Structure 1
């Protein structure tokens, strides 16, 4: 024969129950049977992005052939899974490939249409060394084969819409991703399957949270394959933690260590201590065996329940009379209620932990994938949001108003009250140059997701040309950066949960504001390569200096409201009404006071003492030296980077020179005493 040599008889497998009873998908099975009951062009192809269960649609079609939900044009049909890889890979020679394939077509035509041929990965058939299309073509035209394809949409439009004859030989059935609730229903059927295998239980809140958080976060793989990945991987982690016991291992190491100690000593007391620890070890071991026996009985009774369900389906196919009522009314409710009695018994007895996969397990598995704070406000990030003013003032002294505004913005977003097409929050930082624009940016990226490195800083001062705009969106096809990628859009597509930091957007060309109009309108910024860039998870922050002299000269005896309205008017003179129209909340910075400069110096002393204690020195400072640093590092035009370069040039250059001179000794208290113009270090 040929058919047993190359194909996989799926109806025999579904008759042996080795498949998945996939719930739903009723319209796609209907449209596949609409195609398969035609006269010519009997060839549906199942098209969708991978993971959506096109193989499962074919297997569910086979299960409906076996049970008999099909019309009277498919009953008794066999479904055979041709393996396109299993015909190419023997052909060394001229015409041994076509030998096999003509053998397959003669045996299927001997069956006389009684065999629905199934071909998975149909885009292997076309380019496989003329080969396989130009023999199947006279059979696919006359309907004497019954091919069912299964392919990704990209391989469809690449390997078939090219070759138009084999395009019209087939027929599309567009398969869409399932919904969230359909994903939940699918996973409920698959829970009822999977708890036979991993010997555990699954609580349906973990199922719905798994589906929702997988749809929220995993943006490469698609439903339901990613949800099944999460559920199965958590089931395997719990199958580990059945036999992971740690306390028995600690007690065994303790008793063998005290055994070696007592055997070396042969005052004693250790016969008594070892007897107590052996008694505790035996009790924990017997409790462990009791838990194992409980889980074994629960698994066996769950397996007998599922075999009873399979047997009552056997009675639904065959048609025994008393067997139906007997199996149902006896076997289903009593086995379910003592399955729940075993469930509450395991809830009583599992001290040595879980057999029920909770949502925290899903959080641990998805955190091992990516690392998001996946779950909700867990009173650690939530109290962080309740002290988000304090959390931002942990690193950024001063500028209370913008801290409050950004805190309110993220408090709106994490509660789900943002308009979910816009990005998380637009910001127009104003005011004096170099106070903590970038420090608030770093602190925001820090206490948003990870750290200061989950950002993209873009100097907008460099973009002053038309081809600069074509750079930062991406060059259109047939041109240059279309080879070598866009600028902004690639930086977003690498870091999808990030912060975009612009720098002096007023120094940019007067048209990049229109790209920002698209950004702050809807957060899709279609690049040069024609694929969308999704800003709905990010935070766009823009910095400027359009009223730095205006704010520094009028901060005295003017409140926050008049300052905001005045700088709104001035920015309206500079910018356009559309651009400031799309902004969520323009904040206004104020100039710095000398106590804030002293606080910046304090934080620099904190980080410098940390670095030099990692180096190995114990250094103290007089506050007079702090006052000299504060007076030598502020100006109305530059701000606190004068303090930074003053700290660098007056500490980091001379004191490290004194260290490298073999002068200073690690461990000594090093008081940074003052000079007339400098700071001297002593060894005391």
Structure 2
């Protein structure tokens, strides 16, 4: 009766139907039964990487024992699970723990051959004394039976350190299942999730949840890396079955917020955005009613909705409103970069490719180098495409490869080999892509790097992964890699495509997509630039409202002088701060150009006065 206070009982909990079907893994159940009935040295250990299902093997063994498909020498063994945490509780005297353990071993020994102890996480059995060593004569007589499961590394951290204990055990290596066997499992666990949450589940949902968790979520092994998607889609549908959906709630809370703010200010402005939002919320509401007048189960879109809401990556199915964006993207990106039609037509062809799901799975969604002369826009394009995807300029990861001039700088983006000074810090590129893997990665001035960094950007391409000084293959599988350059500027296409093959190797140019050589500028397509600068200046002094009434001959005059065929559009942005900014900054801190007032500009025969 000593086991009644300290242990538990799986078998009484197995007869009452508290467990899930464990259909799968017949080989390992047969292996455990093959070991457990041996004469001596008959105590197996289930060893596997964490996630693969090791307690469920023992639950399936218990269900098979209660069912009665076991061999002859397993007639009602009544598996009893122990607790090593309950043993050390109040045992604060000189001998209380060892006499408790001796009472437990006596109540195991006086039985004939029945009780099969199940000790989960038996790295705890190593210490627990300050003792804990009076198990070796009980183990090395074939008297204790002791099924117990650990993980992989916790085995070698404790038990391989203890090479005398290690002999009196077996090892049953449990490995990960496949994707098809995951699908075969997920048709069995469906009834419990339909009982606990009152929903319905299509088989298409269970095959899409097993296909779609292979690509995106890559940290956990897959009997249970795909259970959570179903288990959270059911909860989201249970949210939407109760009182109200989601959007209408979103909009109601938002308009209540803007209402609050506005009435507190009593800004206009918001007054408009209120009204607009009230129009929308009205429309939707009516639509809601209409629908009612006219979802109730999970589908293969809801799983992708969960894997899009988690881990950042938008991976739904041809979403609404974005077709008004991606088919407008080739023209919306032109409002910030003027000219270069071929480069934008090639960049859009990598976002509209992978949004529709045509691109290759184990490959980055775009990784391509573009170059030319200076002042053209090759940095402005990368900062201009990542503005509408991300709503901020700082979601870019912009590392500069001008500083990596020598050999050993490569270790700053991979970490340290384990055993050296900076190991707590880890990497400096890799530890920022493992968090939310959807960024845009830049590489500025790839001319300047030592030719050993190209041995790191070589398995990034065509595979997508890299290890580091921590032992974790991060995935670059759906980021966008942008390389810049400045080679040559001395021909149309022949000299720069000779210099690229002169500097780079053939095995690196092979791994790229379309290399995009730019063209420069033209004076007709320069004037269209200039107003942006003026409009940008019209934003910069917006906090004092000194908006500029610029005459059109001034915009004409800024285009004649300032055109250089070799320095791009960069002399113009210094010419503006020489013409306007000097005289305005002199007139602004002396009085007389007080805020809330407007100033025009007129073309003097050499300058332009205020």
- TM bin, normalised by shorter chain, reads 0.7 to 0.9
The alpha carbon displacement at 1:544 in A equals: 0.9
Instruction: Summarize the alignment of residues 359-374 of structure 1 with structure 2, pairs less than 5 Å apart.
Output: 359-374=300-315
Q: Which has the higher helix share?
A: 1
SS across alignment from 2:188? helix
SS across alignment from 1:505? coil
Asked if structure 1 preserves the Cα contact closer than 8 Å seen for 2:308 and 2:316, the reply is no
Asked if structure 1 preserves the Cα contact closer than 8 Å seen for 2:318 and 2:356, the reply is no
Asked if structure 2 preserves the Cα contact closer than 8 Å seen for 1:112 and 1:144, the reply is no
Asked if structure 2 preserves the Cα contact closer than 8 Å seen for 1:430 and 1:544, the reply is yes
Residue of structure 2 in register with 1:171 after alignment: 170
1:583 aligns with 2:512: yes
The alpha carbon displacement at 1:388 in A equals: 4.4
Residue of structure 2 in register with 1:112 after alignment: 112
The alpha carbon displacement at 1:17 in A equals: 0.8
Residue of structure 1 in register with 2:330 after alignment: 389
Asked if structure 2 preserves the Cα contact closer than 8 Å seen for 1:234 and 1:357, the reply is yes
Residue of structure 2 in register with 1:511 after alignment: 452
How far apart are the structure 2 equivalents of 1:83 and 1:429?
63
SS across alignment from 1:234? helix
Residue of structure 2 in register with 1:286 after alignment: none
Residue of structure 2 in register with 1:556 after alignment: none
1:430 counterpart (349, 359, 371): 371
How far apart are the structure 2 equivalents of 1:463 and 1:488?
14
Residues 4 and 520 of structure 1: is their aligned pair in 2 closer, same or farther, counting only changes over 3 Å?
A: same
1:440 aligns with 2:369: no
Residue of structure 1 in register with 2:397 after alignment: 456
Deviations 1:341-396 (A, max 9, x none): xxxxxxxx994994423445445544443333131222544564445433432432
1:639 counterpart (568, 571, 585): 568
1:498 aligns with 2:497: no
Asked if structure 1 preserves the Cα contact closer than 8 Å seen for 2:301 and 2:317, the reply is no
How far apart are the structure 2 equivalents of 1:20 and 1:363?
26
Instruction: Summarize the alignment of residues 75-86 of structure 1 with structure 2, pairs less than 5 Å apart.
Output: 75-86=75-86
The worse-fitting range, judged by mean Cα deviation, of 379-388 and 365-374 is 379-388
SS across alignment from 2:184? helix
Residue of structure 2 in register with 1:356 after alignment: 297
Residues 457 and 246 of structure 1: is their aligned pair in 2 closer, same or farther, counting only changes over 3 Å?
A: closer
How far apart are the structure 2 equivalents of 1:51 and 1:437?
46
Residues 669 and 350 of structure 1: is their aligned pair in 2 closer, same or farther, counting only changes over 3 Å?
A: same
TM-score (norm 2): 0.81
Deviations 1:469-527 (A, max 9, x none): 34344443444445543343334334533332111111122332333333335333333
The alpha carbon displacement at 1:146 in A equals: 1.9
Residues 594 and 80 of structure 1: is their aligned pair in 2 closer, same or farther, counting only changes over 3 Å?
A: farther
| Alignment coverage as a number of residue pairs | 570
The alpha carbon displacement at 1:633 in A equals: 5.7
> Where does structure 1 lack aligned partners over 5 or more consecutive residues?
251-348, 552-563
The alpha carbon displacement at 1:546 in A equals: 1.0
How far apart are the structure 2 equivalents of 1:363 and 1:652?
52
The worse-fitting range, judged by mean Cα deviation, of 611-620 and 484-493 is 611-620
Deviations 1:54-76 (A, max 9, x none): 22221121111111222222231
Residue of structure 2 in register with 1:203 after alignment: 202
Instruction: Summarize the alignment of residues 1-12 of structure 1 with structure 2, pairs less than 5 Å apart.
Output: 1-12=1-12
The worse-fitting range, judged by mean Cα deviation, of 510-519 and 602-611 is 602-611
The alpha carbon displacement at 1:140 in A equals: 2.7
The alpha carbon displacement at 1:431 in A equals: 0.2
Deviations 1:102-158 (A, max 9, x none): 2222222223331221122222222434743x2233323333222222222222222
1:546 aligns with 2:487: yes
Residues 81 and 598 of structure 1: is their aligned pair in 2 closer, same or farther, counting only changes over 3 Å?
A: farther
Residue of structure 2 in register with 1:271 after alignment: none
Alpha-carbon RMSD across the aligned residues, in angstroms, is 3.6
Residues 572 and 16 of structure 1: is their aligned pair in 2 closer, same or farther, counting only changes over 3 Å?
A: same
How far apart are the structure 1 equivalents of 2:544 and 2:7?
69
Asked if structure 1 preserves the Cα contact closer than 8 Å seen for 2:311 and 2:436, the reply is no
SS across alignment from 1:28? helix
Residue of structure 2 in register with 1:68 after alignment: 68
The worse-fitting range, judged by mean Cα deviation, of 648-657 and 522-531 is 648-657
Asked if structure 2 preserves the Cα contact closer than 8 Å seen for 1:90 and 1:97, the reply is no
How far apart are the structure 2 equivalents of 1:444 and 1:626?
28
The worse-fitting range, judged by mean Cα deviation, of 364-373 and 645-654 is 645-654
Deviations 1:512-553 (A, max 9, x none): 2333333335333333445434332223221111122334xx
> Where does structure 2 lack aligned partners over 5 or more consecutive residues?
250-289
1:237 aligns with 2:178: no
Residues 90 and 649 of structure 1: is their aligned pair in 2 closer, same or farther, counting only changes over 3 Å?
A: farther
Asked if structure 1 preserves the Cα contact closer than 8 Å seen for 2:373 and 2:487, the reply is no
Residue of structure 2 in register with 1:329 after alignment: none
The alpha carbon displacement at 1:9 in A equals: 0.8
